[PDB]
RNA sequence: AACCUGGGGAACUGAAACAUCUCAGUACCCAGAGGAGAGGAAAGAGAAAUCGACUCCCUGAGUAGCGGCGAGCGAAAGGGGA
RNA sequence: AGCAGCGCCAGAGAGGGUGAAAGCCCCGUAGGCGAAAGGUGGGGGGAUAGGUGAGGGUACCCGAGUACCCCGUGGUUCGUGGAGCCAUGGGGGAAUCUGGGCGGACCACCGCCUAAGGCUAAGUACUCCGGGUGACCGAUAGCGCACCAGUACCGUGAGGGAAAGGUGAAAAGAACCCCGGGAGGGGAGUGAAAUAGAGCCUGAAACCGUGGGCUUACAAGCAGUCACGGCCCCGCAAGGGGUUGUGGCGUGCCUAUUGAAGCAUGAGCCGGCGACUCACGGUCGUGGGCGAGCUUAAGCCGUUGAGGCGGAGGCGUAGGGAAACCGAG
């Protein structure tokens, strides 16, 4: 409960930091630590592996995982405040202006 | 005008002293200096002589008490009727206490000093000089009975 | 919190209009016997304090 | 002083007053102190070697040890032992005489005239709580928001209007009062205000 | 937890010794009550032919008085309130 | 999110967060809406239990080991006091309104009230609990406990009772090579920063060390100071800094004392903790408001860091006397 936020798996700007601009998929939504994931801050762990099994396991650049407050939505006109509107049963999304 | 300078008054200056210093006051406290200087000392009014008090005086105060102690009894207020000439129409208890130099002592009685104004004055009792006074230009009426 | 008066001397001492501590003299309920008309008829009157008048004025508070 | 500009859609006809003369700085002082001790909590406590947790156990002999003499760890020599003189709450409230506080309300809307910046008003066209409304008035009324304005007035929606502004402190008729009126620079007031702060004295 | 009521109930200490007195009906022990507990519709007040249950705050008042008339202790009625 | 440019919102410019300093990014805020279920709920409504008349006669009833009296005590402002009132351990022991109790011994008068059965909301007290706010603390503070604390540990036991918070924005937590058994390091790498590298922010002092400058093995010392001189260093020089050779001078600090370098007290050293406060009431002084006046207390209304109402009451306007009383005396 409550910890609820921003989006979810979708589509998103990220208006950040080092990322300032990039747009992207959030493959990623993590709410006990607030923070999402895109294809933005994506950094270089040198580690080996942590377990010993399949022996390689990758110098991977991973999706180093955002403060989620560092997004936002998107559609045609891009990036916009979420308002939250009633259909004539249920609860759908609409934006700046548009819908969805 | 601001919170900039409208400041106390040249004088209002809180400073209290403080004892605890190396030049001011200092190893002792503000004064100090030697023993029966720590948490207090006798009285030192009324009490300690060290030895047999100055009530050495003697209670002459006949009428200190009685168990059920004071008896109720008509108390009367001096009022002069010099503070009288201070206004015009029918002076009375009411009066006299609504504003003024009475309150609430259950008695009214005019005296003394001034020059009286010619007119009522009811009252619960006058002074033999006071009586005179107005008595010789207006009227004197007396208080209650029953 | 609020001092007390001190009963004992309002019980044996007046503090005058102005603003003097007068008291009853000392000396004249035994020591009594022969002592002269003087000694006794002087020991009738009220006096006058000094510096404990000002320790007496302490005590008379509300009063 | 005496000639104060109003407001109306008949536009400015600056009526008088009779607010005082001097100016006592110093007692102005004596009530904004006032205001503001009142308005204090008492609320800092601290615990005396009393109301702190340890046991009183002498902790040791005091004699042949010969460690230094001691009592209970509560005594605050010892570190985490009670605090001495430390605060208890209280109430930092005195009665600031009537007359002060009313030679001082007079004085304060009186320093800010003779200024000029005291202004009585009426047309509050500001129809609605809305900033933006009142923002408009403000504009066509000589309150740029360059200045620092407590507006006073009964009409609660203008009050509403003024509100979110940080120029502004709105603020009801009775609600007039000293700290208020030196904190800021303008004063701005309905007449059925100024009459009521006549009626507190006029 | 604390608050409350009843049964029981200290001493250091103060009095510049101390015993009455004080500390204090406090500390504590015990029984009970409860969202409170007590008190409560006059065999009352106490001096006005007056008031009109009870409880709480302001006041009365450090007054009235109590007191090895020491140290100290310390009301009520009435008045303003809830 | 700073700076700049041009905009907008505001019944919302409380506050928090986001890589630093954001009304407009995020969570909020103002304003407004919501309960099937459980709890609460006379605030509104309804109903039931109950309740309400006037005169006359009658003298039936109106709370018993009770009133009352005495002995012993308690409560009260009341300490045996002139000692009532209320309460009651012991003894005696009534009446039913021609009854009884009280109004401070007692009596007479006048007046008040109806004991010896019980119940009664509100106003009041408190704070384990939830929330809000702070001229409250910020890890030796604040609760004993910010941390896995009433723990560890200590006591047979009652019981006592600690210490211990902080990488970074993100773990990106340092692959890999090298020396080493490991530990730990050196490179490489990440990071804005790694003397931010993992009890890792800042990182003071005591304390230990390595390098450099001046200095010291015929010299006497509260360890410094004054002078001159040599050396080293900064500056073009006039100058300054460091060091100390010789000469002059020179009895630690605090405490306590007639008197201390004192062979009197205290102190290994450093860091942090550590002692004249507040409440009420007095009394002087002082800044100010008002003035023969001045001032409100609880509280009520307002607000939600707004004030106002509230004269009960207090101080003052008359003193003197033990008092009755009299009164500028
Ligand atoms: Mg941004
Ligand atoms: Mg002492
Ligand atoms: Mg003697
Ligand atoms: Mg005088
Ligand atoms: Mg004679
Ligand atoms: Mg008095
Ligand atoms: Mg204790
Ligand atoms: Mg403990
Ligand atoms: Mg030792
Ligand atoms: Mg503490
Ligand atoms: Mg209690
Ligand atoms: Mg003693
Ligand atoms: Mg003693
Ligand atoms: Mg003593
Ligand atoms: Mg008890
Ligand atoms: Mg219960
Ligand atoms: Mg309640
Ligand atoms: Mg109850
Ligand atoms: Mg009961
Ligand atoms: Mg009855
Ligand atoms: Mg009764
Ligand atoms: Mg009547
Ligand atoms: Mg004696
Ligand atoms: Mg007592
Ligand atoms: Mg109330
Ligand atoms: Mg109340
Ligand atoms: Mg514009
Ligand atoms: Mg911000
Ligand atoms: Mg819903
Ligand atoms: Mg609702
Ligand atoms: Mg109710
Ligand atoms: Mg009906
Ligand atoms: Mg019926
Ligand atoms: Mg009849
Ligand atoms: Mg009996
Ligand atoms: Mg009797
Ligand atoms: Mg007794
Ligand atoms: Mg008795
Ligand atoms: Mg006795
Ligand atoms: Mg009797
Ligand atoms: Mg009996
Ligand atoms: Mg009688
Ligand atoms: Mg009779
Ligand atoms: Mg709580
Ligand atoms: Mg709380
Ligand atoms: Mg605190
Ligand atoms: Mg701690
Ligand atoms: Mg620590
Ligand atoms: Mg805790
Ligand atoms: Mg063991
Ligand atoms: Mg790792
Ligand atoms: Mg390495
Ligand atoms: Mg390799
Ligand atoms: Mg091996
Ligand atoms: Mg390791
Ligand atoms: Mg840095
Ligand atoms: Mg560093
Ligand atoms: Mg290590
Ligand atoms: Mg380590
Ligand atoms: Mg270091
Ligand atoms: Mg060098
Ligand atoms: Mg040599
Ligand atoms: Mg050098
Ligand atoms: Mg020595
Ligand atoms: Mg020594
Ligand atoms: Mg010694
Ligand atoms: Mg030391
Ligand atoms: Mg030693
Ligand atoms: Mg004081």
């Known amino acids: 409960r409550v910890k609820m936020h921003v989006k979810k798996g979708d589509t998103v700007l990220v208006a950040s930091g080092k990322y300032k601009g990039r747009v992207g998929k959030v493959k990623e939504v993590l709410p006990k630590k607030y923070a999402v994931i895109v294809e933005g801050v994506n950094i270089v762990k040198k580690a080996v592996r942590v377990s010993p099994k399949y022996p390689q396991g990758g110098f991977i650049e991973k999706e180093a995982p955002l403060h989620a407050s560092k997004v936002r939505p998107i559609c045609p006109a891009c990036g916009k405040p979420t308002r939250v509107r009633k259909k004539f049963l249920e609860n759908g999304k609409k934006i700046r202006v548009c819908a969805k | 005008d601001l919170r900039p300078n409208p400041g106390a008054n040249k004088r209002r200056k809180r400073v209290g002293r403080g004892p605890g210093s190396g030049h001011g006051k200092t190893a002792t406290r503000g004064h100090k200096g030697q023993k029966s200087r720590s948490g207090g000392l006798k009285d030192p009014r009324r009490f300690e002589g060290g030895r047999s008090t100055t009530l050495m005086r003697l209670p002459k105060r006949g009428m200190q008490g009685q168990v059920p102690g004071e008896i109720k009894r008509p108390r009367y207020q001096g009022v002069n009727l010099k503070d009288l000439a201070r206004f015009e129409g029918e002076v009375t208890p009411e009066l006299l206490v609504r504003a003024g130099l009475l309150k609430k002592g259950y008695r009214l009685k005019i005296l003394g000093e001034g020059e009286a104004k010619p007119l009522k004055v009811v009252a619960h009792a006058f002074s033999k000089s006071a009586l005179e006074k107005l008595k010789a230009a207006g009227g004197e009426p007396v208080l209650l009975e029953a | 919190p609020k001092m007390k008066t001190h009963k004992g001397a309002k019980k044996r001492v007046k503090i005058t209009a102005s603003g003097k501590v007068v008291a009853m003299k000392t000396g004249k309920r035994h020591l009594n016997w022969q002592k002269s008309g003087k000694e006794i008829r002087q020991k009738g009157r009220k006096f006058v304090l000094a510096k404990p008048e000002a320790e007496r004025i302490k005590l008379l508070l509300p009063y | 002083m005496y000639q104060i500009p109003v407001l109306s859609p008949s536009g400015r006809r600056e009526l008088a007053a009779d607010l005082p003369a001097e100016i006592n700085p110093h007692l102005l002082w004596e009530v904004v102190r006032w205001q503001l001790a009142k308005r204090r909590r008492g609320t800092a406590s601290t615990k005396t070697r009393g109301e702190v947790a340890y046991s009183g156990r002498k902790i040791w ?54 200024e000029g910046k005291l202004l009585l008003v009426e047309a509050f066209a500001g129809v609605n709580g809305k900033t933006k409304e009142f923002l408009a008035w403000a504009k066509e009324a000589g309150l740029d928001g360059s200045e620092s304005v407590l507006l006073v007035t009964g009409n609660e929606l203008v009050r509403r209007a003024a509100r979110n502004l940080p120029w502004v402190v709105t603020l009801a008729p009775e609600g007039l009062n000293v700290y208020d009126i030196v904190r800021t620079e303008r004063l701005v007031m309905d007449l059925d205000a100024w009459e009521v702060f006549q009626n507190r004295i006029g």
């Open chain 4, 61 to 114: 002999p005091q004699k042949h040890t010969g460690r230094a003499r001691h009592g209970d760890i509560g005594a605050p020599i010892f570190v985490g032992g009670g605090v001495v003189f430390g605060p208890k709450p209280r109430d930092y409230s005195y009665t600031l005489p009537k007359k002060v506080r009313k030679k001082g309300l007079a004085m304060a809307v009186a320093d800010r005239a003779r």
